[PDB]
Amino acid sequence: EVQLVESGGGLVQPGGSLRLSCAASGFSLTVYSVHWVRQAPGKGLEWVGALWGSGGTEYNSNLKSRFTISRDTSKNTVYLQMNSLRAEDTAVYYCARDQGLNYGSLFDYWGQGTLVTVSSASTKGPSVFPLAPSSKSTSGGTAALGCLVKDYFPEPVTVSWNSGALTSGVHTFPAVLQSSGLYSLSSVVTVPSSSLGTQTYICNVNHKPSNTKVDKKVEP
Amino acid sequence: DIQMTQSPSSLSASVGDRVTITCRASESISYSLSWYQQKPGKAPKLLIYNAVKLESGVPSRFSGSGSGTDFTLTISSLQPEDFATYYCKQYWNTPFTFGQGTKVEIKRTVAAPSVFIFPPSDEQLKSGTASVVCLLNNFYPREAKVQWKVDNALQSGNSQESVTEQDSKDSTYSLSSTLTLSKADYEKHKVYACEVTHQGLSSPVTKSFNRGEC
Amino acid sequence: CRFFESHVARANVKHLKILNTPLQIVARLKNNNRQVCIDPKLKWIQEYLEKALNK
């Protein structure tokens, strides 16, 4: 029942600042220590720093103290203040609870992760286009339809199908940065071509940095 | 600063194969080493701590051993859901440092890709850009070839490929190919074809559509 | 002291505490703030005590 939730992720300009949060429930920060770990996209894991229950702070020396870890026991929430960010600071930022075994620091509970992007680019919402499942005359095997989430910045974009009712057969491809500097992906789903003639498929695109949400119904 | 190094970077074994992953430290760390499992889009999951201790809830097909500068994680019987990147973490000295990861792929029987072709919707054509998408679905191995032929002419430099991570149940992949051309260039051709070459295919499969049809 | 806690990381030790015979070494841990009995003949303890005695 221990639950960690990060928030505050988003786009930041180079040299800019940002704060993240980590609301912890099911345990007290007075007993358990909490750590921040970051992971650059498609890279390795990097221990940012620790916040003990005592509680002082431990930092990774390689960060040049451009980060500050803090705690508010009354909220049971941990923070991370980010200062003068570089492009290299673009990463998913996790918080993790210290198991508290005598052995040393071990991360037993983690948060979902929040993504900080450092870029001089402007935010843009995704245009959503349907990928029409033209049969075009063959119906028996699985049919294929989806959505084309084109031209958005920055990551991430949340794609769903039928408000989560569809939990199988769906492939949402990792976005690929285009020449324009705008990401783009497709979300396909294989369904029985038998219906189609009954079932209504809707995709749910959500882009938080742009505050845009688009519901597109895909019909043959 | 203790830097951790792992071998190998990648590996592919079958369901039921023993697999080991080496973790070396640039300096002695005694028994203060842990092992983490991370699936795509998710947070790391602690497996082994104190070199050889398995934490609660983790299947005992996982095993750890080692001490000093040499450590090793053993998966005694590979399961389809073992697809992940495995990291080792040192907590002997600050800063705590991670290995660069080890990529574990599942080997399985050859699976031919089901292919689909998607024409650009009219709603998209308004803005002035056409996106043609070819879909390769549920195949293994991941190596595949996709060529775009527009009115039987071989395309080059316009397409972009993207691949999904390996499935945790049937260990297949899915590949998308997007052909990008302007509204002008899209409306000066007819036949748009996608040619797929794969090991599961005895003969290359071609999916195609015309233009301006239902 | 008592027995010796096994396999305690050095980075998890805030400071050492030598008791007056009740070697008796106790380590204050950083992650859980407990007091743990440390093994005196460990190599990293012998090197820690040297740094403190200016040697």
PDB file of N, CA, C and O in Angstrom, chain A residues 31-33 52-54 58 98-106, chain C residues 5-12 14 29-34 36:
ATOM      1  N   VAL A  31      10.291   7.749   9.333  1.00  0.00           N
ATOM      2  CA  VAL A  31      10.834   6.415   9.537  1.00  0.00           C
ATOM      3  C   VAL A  31      11.672   5.981   8.337  1.00  0.00           C
ATOM      4  O   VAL A  31      12.739   5.386   8.495  1.00  0.00           O
ATOM      5  N   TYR A  32      11.182   6.292   7.140  1.00  0.00           N
ATOM      6  CA  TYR A  32      11.807   5.831   5.904  1.00  0.00           C
ATOM      7  C   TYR A  32      12.453   6.955   5.094  1.00  0.00           C
ATOM      8  O   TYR A  32      11.903   8.054   4.981  1.00  0.00           O
ATOM      9  N   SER A  33      13.618   6.657   4.526  1.00  0.00           N
ATOM     10  CA  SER A  33      14.338   7.602   3.684  1.00  0.00           C
ATOM     11  C   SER A  33      13.846   7.509   2.245  1.00  0.00           C
ATOM     12  O   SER A  33      13.328   6.472   1.827  1.00  0.00           O
ATOM     13  N   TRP A  52      17.217  11.401   4.181  1.00  0.00           N
ATOM     14  CA  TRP A  52      17.044  10.475   5.299  1.00  0.00           C
ATOM     15  C   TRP A  52      15.853  10.841   6.183  1.00  0.00           C
ATOM     16  O   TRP A  52      15.309  11.948   6.092  1.00  0.00           O
ATOM     17  N   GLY A  53      15.450   9.902   7.038  1.00  0.00           N
ATOM     18  CA  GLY A  53      14.348  10.128   7.958  1.00  0.00           C
ATOM     19  C   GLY A  53      14.761  10.950   9.164  1.00  0.00           C
ATOM     20  O   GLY A  53      13.916  11.530   9.847  1.00  0.00           O
ATOM     21  N   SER A  54      16.064  10.992   9.423  1.00  0.00           N
ATOM     22  CA  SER A  54      16.620  11.744  10.552  1.00  0.00           C
ATOM     23  C   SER A  54      16.225  13.237  10.668  1.00  0.00           C
ATOM     24  O   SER A  54      15.775  13.653  11.734  1.00  0.00           O
ATOM     25  N   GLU A  58      21.846  13.688   1.278  1.00  0.00           N
ATOM     26  CA  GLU A  58      23.052  13.217   0.612  1.00  0.00           C
ATOM     27  C   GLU A  58      22.917  13.484  -0.881  1.00  0.00           C
ATOM     28  O   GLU A  58      21.873  13.201  -1.465  1.00  0.00           O
ATOM     29  N   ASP A  98      13.692   4.227   0.420  1.00  0.00           N
ATOM     30  CA  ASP A  98      14.757   3.388   0.951  1.00  0.00           C
ATOM     31  C   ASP A  98      14.136   2.313   1.834  1.00  0.00           C
ATOM     32  O   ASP A  98      13.423   2.622   2.794  1.00  0.00           O
ATOM     33  N   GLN A  99      14.414   1.053   1.514  1.00  0.00           N
ATOM     34  CA  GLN A  99      13.836  -0.066   2.249  1.00  0.00           C
ATOM     35  C   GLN A  99      14.149  -0.002   3.743  1.00  0.00           C
ATOM     36  O   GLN A  99      13.371  -0.480   4.568  1.00  0.00           O
ATOM     37  N   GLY A 100      15.288   0.592   4.083  1.00  0.00           N
ATOM     38  CA  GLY A 100      15.655   0.790   5.471  1.00  0.00           C
ATOM     39  C   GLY A 100      16.292  -0.417   6.134  1.00  0.00           C
ATOM     40  O   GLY A 100      16.279  -0.530   7.363  1.00  0.00           O
ATOM     41  N   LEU A 101      16.842  -1.323   5.332  1.00  0.00           N
ATOM     42  CA  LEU A 101      17.582  -2.457   5.867  1.00  0.00           C
ATOM     43  C   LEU A 101      18.965  -1.971   6.289  1.00  0.00           C
ATOM     44  O   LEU A 101      19.500  -1.032   5.690  1.00  0.00           O
ATOM     45  N   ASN A 102      19.545  -2.600   7.309  1.00  0.00           N
ATOM     46  CA  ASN A 102      20.855  -2.182   7.808  1.00  0.00           C
ATOM     47  C   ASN A 102      21.938  -2.267   6.737  1.00  0.00           C
ATOM     48  O   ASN A 102      22.939  -1.559   6.812  1.00  0.00           O
ATOM     49  N   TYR A 103      21.732  -3.139   5.753  1.00  0.00           N
ATOM     50  CA  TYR A 103      22.712  -3.363   4.689  1.00  0.00           C
ATOM     51  C   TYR A 103      23.126  -2.059   4.013  1.00  0.00           C
ATOM     52  O   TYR A 103      24.307  -1.823   3.761  1.00  0.00           O
ATOM     53  N   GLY A 104      22.145  -1.213   3.734  1.00  0.00           N
ATOM     54  CA  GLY A 104      22.394   0.034   3.045  1.00  0.00           C
ATOM     55  C   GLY A 104      21.157   0.446   2.285  1.00  0.00           C
ATOM     56  O   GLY A 104      20.075  -0.095   2.528  1.00  0.00           O
ATOM     57  N   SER A 105      21.319   1.390   1.361  1.00  0.00           N
ATOM     58  CA  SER A 105      20.189   1.943   0.618  1.00  0.00           C
ATOM     59  C   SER A 105      19.694   1.006  -0.481  1.00  0.00           C
ATOM     60  O   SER A 105      20.423   0.697  -1.426  1.00  0.00           O
ATOM     61  N   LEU A 106      18.448   0.565  -0.348  1.00  0.00           N
ATOM     62  CA  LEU A 106      17.833  -0.324  -1.324  1.00  0.00           C
ATOM     63  C   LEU A 106      16.438   0.180  -1.676  1.00  0.00           C
ATOM     64  O   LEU A 106      15.623   0.447  -0.793  1.00  0.00           O
TER      65      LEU A 106
ATOM     66  N   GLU C   5      26.577  -7.179  13.345  1.00  0.00           N
ATOM     67  CA  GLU C   5      25.736  -7.062  12.161  1.00  0.00           C
ATOM     68  C   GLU C   5      26.606  -7.313  10.939  1.00  0.00           C
ATOM     69  O   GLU C   5      27.682  -6.726  10.805  1.00  0.00           O
ATOM     70  N   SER C   6      26.151  -8.195  10.057  1.00  0.00           N
ATOM     71  CA  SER C   6      26.948  -8.588   8.902  1.00  0.00           C
ATOM     72  C   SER C   6      26.598  -7.794   7.641  1.00  0.00           C
ATOM     73  O   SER C   6      25.443  -7.426   7.423  1.00  0.00           O
ATOM     74  N   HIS C   7      27.620  -7.520   6.832  1.00  0.00           N
ATOM     75  CA  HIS C   7      27.474  -6.873   5.526  1.00  0.00           C
ATOM     76  C   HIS C   7      26.794  -5.503   5.546  1.00  0.00           C
ATOM     77  O   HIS C   7      25.875  -5.243   4.767  1.00  0.00           O
ATOM     78  N   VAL C   8      27.262  -4.623   6.424  1.00  0.00           N
ATOM     79  CA  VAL C   8      26.784  -3.246   6.438  1.00  0.00           C
ATOM     80  C   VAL C   8      27.677  -2.375   5.558  1.00  0.00           C
ATOM     81  O   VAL C   8      28.887  -2.301   5.772  1.00  0.00           O
ATOM     82  N   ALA C   9      27.073  -1.735   4.558  1.00  0.00           N
ATOM     83  CA  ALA C   9      27.801  -0.868   3.637  1.00  0.00           C
ATOM     84  C   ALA C   9      28.435   0.303   4.377  1.00  0.00           C
ATOM     85  O   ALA C   9      27.881   0.787   5.364  1.00  0.00           O
ATOM     86  N   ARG C  10      29.597   0.747   3.901  1.00  0.00           N
ATOM     87  CA  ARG C  10      30.305   1.861   4.525  1.00  0.00           C
ATOM     88  C   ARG C  10      29.548   3.177   4.339  1.00  0.00           C
ATOM     89  O   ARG C  10      29.505   4.022   5.242  1.00  0.00           O
ATOM     90  N   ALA C  11      28.937   3.335   3.170  1.00  0.00           N
ATOM     91  CA  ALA C  11      28.196   4.547   2.852  1.00  0.00           C
ATOM     92  C   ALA C  11      26.934   4.692   3.699  1.00  0.00           C
ATOM     93  O   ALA C  11      26.332   5.762   3.724  1.00  0.00           O
ATOM     94  N   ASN C  12      26.538   3.623   4.388  1.00  0.00           N
ATOM     95  CA  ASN C  12      25.360   3.666   5.250  1.00  0.00           C
ATOM     96  C   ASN C  12      25.706   4.021   6.695  1.00  0.00           C
ATOM     97  O   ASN C  12      24.839   4.041   7.565  1.00  0.00           O
ATOM     98  N   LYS C  14      26.868   6.704   9.348  1.00  0.00           N
ATOM     99  CA  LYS C  14      26.984   8.130   9.630  1.00  0.00           C
ATOM    100  C   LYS C  14      28.251   8.407  10.433  1.00  0.00           C
ATOM    101  O   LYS C  14      29.096   9.205  10.023  1.00  0.00           O
ATOM    102  N   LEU C  29      23.532   4.305  11.638  1.00  0.00           N
ATOM    103  CA  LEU C  29      23.148   4.109  10.242  1.00  0.00           C
ATOM    104  C   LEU C  29      22.331   5.285   9.711  1.00  0.00           C
ATOM    105  O   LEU C  29      21.529   5.875  10.433  1.00  0.00           O
ATOM    106  N   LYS C  30      22.540   5.623   8.444  1.00  0.00           N
ATOM    107  CA  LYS C  30      21.945   6.823   7.880  1.00  0.00           C
ATOM    108  C   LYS C  30      20.530   6.616   7.341  1.00  0.00           C
ATOM    109  O   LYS C  30      19.698   7.527   7.409  1.00  0.00           O
ATOM    110  N   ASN C  31      20.250   5.431   6.812  1.00  0.00           N
ATOM    111  CA  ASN C  31      18.956   5.206   6.179  1.00  0.00           C
ATOM    112  C   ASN C  31      17.811   4.973   7.161  1.00  0.00           C
ATOM    113  O   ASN C  31      16.671   5.344   6.876  1.00  0.00           O
ATOM    114  N   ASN C  32      18.112   4.377   8.314  1.00  0.00           N
ATOM    115  CA  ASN C  32      17.081   4.111   9.322  1.00  0.00           C
ATOM    116  C   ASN C  32      17.394   4.640  10.729  1.00  0.00           C
ATOM    117  O   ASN C  32      16.604   4.463  11.659  1.00  0.00           O
ATOM    118  N   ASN C  33      18.555   5.274  10.875  1.00  0.00           N
ATOM    119  CA  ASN C  33      18.957   5.925  12.125  1.00  0.00           C
ATOM    120  C   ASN C  33      19.115   4.983  13.324  1.00  0.00           C
ATOM    121  O   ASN C  33      19.066   5.422  14.479  1.00  0.00           O
ATOM    122  N   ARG C  34      19.317   3.697  13.051  1.00  0.00           N
ATOM    123  CA  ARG C  34      19.532   2.726  14.120  1.00  0.00           C
ATOM    124  C   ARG C  34      20.974   2.752  14.604  1.00  0.00           C
ATOM    125  O   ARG C  34      21.848   3.327  13.949  1.00  0.00           O
ATOM    126  N   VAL C  36      23.905   0.086  15.288  1.00  0.00           N
ATOM    127  CA  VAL C  36      24.254  -1.298  14.996  1.00  0.00           C
ATOM    128  C   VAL C  36      25.666  -1.611  15.494  1.00  0.00           C
ATOM    129  O   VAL C  36      26.570  -0.783  15.392  1.00  0.00           O
TER     130      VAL C  36
END
